[PDB]
Design a protein around this nucleic acid. Structure first.
Ligand SMILES: [Mg+2]
Ligand SMILES: [Mg+2]
Ligand SMILES: [Mg+2]
Ligand SMILES: [Mg+2]
Ligand SMILES: [Mg+2]
Ligand SMILES: [Mg+2]
Ligand SMILES: [Mg+2]
Ligand SMILES: [Mg+2]
Ligand SMILES: [Mg+2]
Lengths: 197, 191, 136, 172
RNA sequence: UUUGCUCCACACAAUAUAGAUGGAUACGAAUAAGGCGUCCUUGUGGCGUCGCUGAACCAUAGCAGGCUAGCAACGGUGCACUUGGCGGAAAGGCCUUGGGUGCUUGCUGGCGAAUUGCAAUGUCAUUUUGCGUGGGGAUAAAUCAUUUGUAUACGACUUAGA
RNA sequence: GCAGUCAAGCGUUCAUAGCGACAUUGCUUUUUGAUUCUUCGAUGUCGGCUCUUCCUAUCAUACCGAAGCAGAAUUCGGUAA
RNA sequence: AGAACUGGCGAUGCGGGAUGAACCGAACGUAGAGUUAAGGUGCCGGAAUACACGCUCAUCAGACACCACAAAAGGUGUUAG
RNA sequence: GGCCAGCAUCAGUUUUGGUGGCAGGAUAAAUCCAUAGGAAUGUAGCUUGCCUCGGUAAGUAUUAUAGCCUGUG
């Protein structure tokens, strides 16, 4: 029930996340996925490196240019999977992909704004404890993606500043928590507890 | 069949003090300190009374249980390592050409340098791992001794030296030339 | 220095546990475990609120942080006197969980006129609080 | 097949002038209804005696309710069944509150572990084991130990909303 | 090339909308673990407490929100000024010192609304340009045609010329 | 045509390092048969020259394992086009 | 390639088997409302990321009749006997 | 009397809820109460390695300062 939804894509499974995002877009809902390089995939690394090499060998024989494109960045590996689940050659399907924005890391506009999670795609709950999985930053790098260590440092910059903002908010919420406790005494506090609030 | 619960007992001596949060197993003792990440394994450590700790598995399959017995041993060996320490001894074997081994410096890293293995010009370097301490044994001919806290380091550092000296394109049944691990032991005596 | 191992403390399923039912004909009423069958199913028996004695699947019930003494496989007559002996109803009712349950039930049942009163009172409390934030 | 019940069936050929008053044979069937229960009877009387539904008659078809519906027992179920190759015999070991429930698990289990269908199985004899230490199997025996406690690690929470604002914990 | 060009005020006109109608309400990590408070010996520390969904929290009374008569506070927030900070991943925003100014349902009063006739979204958003009002600001290039050959099928390219 | 399985005889002693008969279970469409679905108001019917690309059932070239591998010289098998 | 009985396509659209003469469902004047068949209910795509007991992890997993293939022979992989 | 609506009482087809009275079965089976026997996943009690101000101890014991099962009413 919000005009933009920002989904911190970390600890998620590509396909299970990808299925909910596609349906939301089609129904009219602006979505923006951040932090794509922390995503996960069921099954061990070596399996999933070999699935990407199977995609690479497919190309238009008479002229490689016109044939299928292989994007290596994790934002665009997630985009592919999501473009699969939308009727993208119609005008309705374009408009749905126009409501979407994917990003490696968390750039300026979106890092002072609340982020949410999709629990039905969240791999901590869905996978059985013991099964193997693949991190989508690691995989991208192994098929040539040359901005892992740039995103690894930029994220470390904002984690520090975000940790500094929270120390001032958490200290301020203690004062507000102490005030609501002491105010909870006079008849105005007792009448709301009867009335429910 | 899924076992309702299985558990083993890590028996701690009097000297050391083993700390565990999440699954990061610190073990401080007389020889030094050792650490180990176990967050890959899925078990619950539980203290009872200082000199005994229980490891447990609940609703575990067959393979899940097996690992539970492994985690006991790795944690046992940190305890025996930091108290007693590990010591591997290796020997050189040859017929015609004697193997010349020597520790050499290179950007403050320390390498074991094997020279004249079987009449070869190629010099063979083996980098010395962090913690392990190599010394060539006096009054025992063609012997070398490695020693330290970790087994995982010492044994690997020995096996590296063992694997640097292989004979290619000959009959190894005949050409039995090399540097072989003779005795695995502890540093301290008694136990 | 001592060892200092952590714990991973848990709510167990055993004889004498008290539980809250998620979904069913009972749904939201307290019950107590009598005897276990296997990993997934157990035998409950809540003698008081209005829940038959039944084998129930652990997917359809939630465990509380409370246990009372009970012999294995005790009959409803024994469990009824044991529950009243345990003094568990007032102990459940005194806790935060049950208070939070009792609140969202009270917020549901709230006539349009009262929701106004609430607004007239919270505006009135707001003023007394924000002066305290202004002072210190 | 379905949520089972237990029935009693009795039948006795048809009567004749040369031989009035035949013999009365009886069985205990597990089925979802009476119509399947009558059919199973005539299936099992054809495997033994020289009779069929044309020559025969049913005398009384009676439901058998459970004797102690809320008491935990240890059943020992024999069973005969067809594989793809041959046709074998077994002894599984089940623990439940009623006989009809033990039969409801046994059919579900033989389907998982062996790919044996309803058609390919004969329940020979379900027998309640009165005494303890008359349990050959291991996976029932674990639960028979004294002062039995066990946790439930890794709790999950089925949500109504698609998005969530907190980030969940798997504590219990 | 008939007072052209540009940014800022308000005045009228057009032409649209993949679709406002209280608030996108900011740690990070773990999940066989943690959050929030507190006390020390600041640690992988002791003690307390929470979860079992945001069913939350914040805002929410006046003609689509009027005109006035008071009380208690020295709070609560908009509107244009103003002092100082931080933000380069796509920063285009965020905090902040000091006045000015409107309101204040934090509490008590005095007026007004009818007739849109028993319902008819009953119109209150935000893009892109035009056109005149009146206050600042700034005073060039490119192509053809001629010319070079580090270039050249033609175009293109590379040079020179008040 | 290519591959297993069982292993007769061999390989001075010795079934299985390696040669490997006959049986029994398959894959291939680079052979030839069998058939006649498409084309008889026409799809240019051998080979060579020229030139790109693909397959691996790998002759060589890289790293390995076995040997009835002292060395040299070989033989068998694995990853790999 | 040639026969026996029945049902069909030919002469026949409509829903299902992605696609298809013959398979499954069902056979058609023109409209409204209800209900189902065969088939289905993560997203494409209208409809349960339903409930329940189990099995399986694969450095070629497996995924719905007709149908678009796989065998002998092996495996202290794991599960029931 | 033309264009378009809203609200009532009615009829035909239908869809989705709340709710009363009866019948059947082992005249439900259970639970629950009156009752005879029985025992191990053994309560109190008793006795022994006993021993960190008292619990453990591994035997006995058939309800006692837990209880449980089976027949019959
Ligand atoms: Mg022809
Ligand atoms: Mg033609
Ligand atoms: Mg041609
Ligand atoms: Mg190959
Ligand atoms: Mg014809
Ligand atoms: Mg037809
Ligand atoms: Mg098909
Ligand atoms: Mg048919
Ligand atoms: Mg849908």
């Amino acid at each position: 029930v919000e005009p933009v939804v920002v989904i911190d894509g970390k600890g998620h499974l590509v396909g299970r996340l990808a299925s909910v995002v596609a349906k939301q877009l089609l129904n009219g809902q602006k979505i923006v996925v951040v932090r794509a390089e922390e995503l996960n995939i069921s099954g061990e690394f070596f399996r999933n490196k070999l699935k990407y090499h199977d995609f690479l060998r497919k190309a238009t024989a008479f002229n490689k240019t016109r044939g299928p494109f292989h994007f290596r960045a994790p934002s665009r590996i997630f985009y592919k999977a999501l473009r699969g689940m939308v009727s993208h050659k119609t005008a309705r399907g374009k408009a749905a992909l126009e409501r979407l924005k994917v990003f490696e890391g968390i750039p300026p506009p979106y890092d002072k704004k609340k982020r949410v999670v999709v629990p039905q795609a969240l791999r901590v709950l869905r996978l059985k404890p013991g099964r193997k999985y693949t991190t989508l930053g690691k995989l991208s790098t192994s098929v040539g993606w040359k901005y892992e260590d740039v995103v690894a440092k930029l994220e470390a910059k904002r984690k520090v500043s975000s940790a500094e903002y929270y120390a001032k908010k958490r200290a301020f919420t203690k004062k507000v928590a102490s005030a609501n406790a002491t105010a909870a005494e006079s008849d105005v506090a007792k009448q709301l507890a009867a009335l429910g609030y | 069949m899924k076992y309702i619960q299985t558990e083993q007992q890590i028996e701690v001596p009097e000297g050391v003090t083993v700390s565990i949060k999440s699954r990061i197993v610190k073990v401080v003792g007389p020889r030094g300190t050792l650490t180990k990440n176990l967050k890959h394994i899925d078990v619950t450590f539980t203290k009872v009374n200082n000199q005994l700790i229980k490891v447990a598995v609940h609703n575990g399959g067959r393979k899940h249980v097996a690992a539970l017995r492994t985690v006991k041993s790795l944690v046992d060996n940190m305890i025996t390592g930091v108290t007693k320490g590990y010591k591997y001894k290796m020997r050189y074997v040859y017929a015609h050409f004697p193997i010349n081994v020597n520790i050499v410096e290179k950007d403050g890293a320390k390498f074991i340098e094997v020279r004249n293995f079987l009449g070869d010009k190629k010099i063979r370097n083996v980098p010395v791992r962090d913690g392990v301490t190599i010394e060539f044994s006096t009054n025992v001919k063609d012997e070398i001794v490695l020693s330290g806290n970790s087994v995982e380091d010492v044994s690997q550092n020995a096996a590296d030296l063992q694997q640097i000296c292989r004979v290619r394109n000959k009959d190894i049944r005949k050409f039995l030339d090399g540097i072989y691990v003779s005795h695995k032991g502890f540093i301290t005596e008694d136990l | 220095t001592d060892s200092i191992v952590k714990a991973s403390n848990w709510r167990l399923v055993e004889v004498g546990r008290v539980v809250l039912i998620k979904k069913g004909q009972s749904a939201g009423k307290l019950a107590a475990i009598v005897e276990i069958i296997d990993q997934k199913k157990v035998l409950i028996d809540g003698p008081k609120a209005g829940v038959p004695r039944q084998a129930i699947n652990l997917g359809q019930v939630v465990l509380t942080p409370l246990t009372f003494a009970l012999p294995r496989g005790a009959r409803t007559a024994t469990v009824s006197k044991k529950w009243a002996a345990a003094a568990v109803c007032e102990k459940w009712a005194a806790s935060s969980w049950a208070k939070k349950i009792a609140q969202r039930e009270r917020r549901a049942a709230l006539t349009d006129f009262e929701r106004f009163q609430v607004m007239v009172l919270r505006k009135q409390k707001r003023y007394t609080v924000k002066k305290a934030l202004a002072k210190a | 097949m379905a949520h089972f019940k237990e029935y009693q069936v009795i039948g006795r050929r048809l009567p004749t002038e040369s031989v009035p008053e035949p013999k009365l044979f009886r069985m205990r069937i597990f089925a979802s209804n009476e119509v399947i229960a009558k059919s199973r009877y005539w299936y099992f009387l054809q495997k033994l005696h020289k009779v069929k539904k044309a020559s025969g008659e049913i005398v009384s078809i009676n439901q058998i309710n459970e004797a102690h519906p809320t008491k935990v027992k240890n059943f020992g179920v024999w069973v005969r069944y067809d594989s793809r190759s041959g046709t074998h015999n077994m002894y599984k070991e089940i623990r439940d509150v009623s006989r009809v429930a033990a039969v409801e698990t046994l059919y579900q289990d033989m389907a998982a572990r062996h790919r044996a269908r309803f058609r390919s199985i004969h329940i020979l004899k379900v027998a309640e084991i009165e005494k303890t230490a008359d349990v050959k199997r291991q996976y029932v025996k674990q639960f028979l130990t004294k002062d039995l406690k066990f946790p439930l690690p890794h709790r999950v929470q089925k949500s109504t909303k698609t998005f969530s604002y907190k980030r969940p914990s798997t504590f219990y």
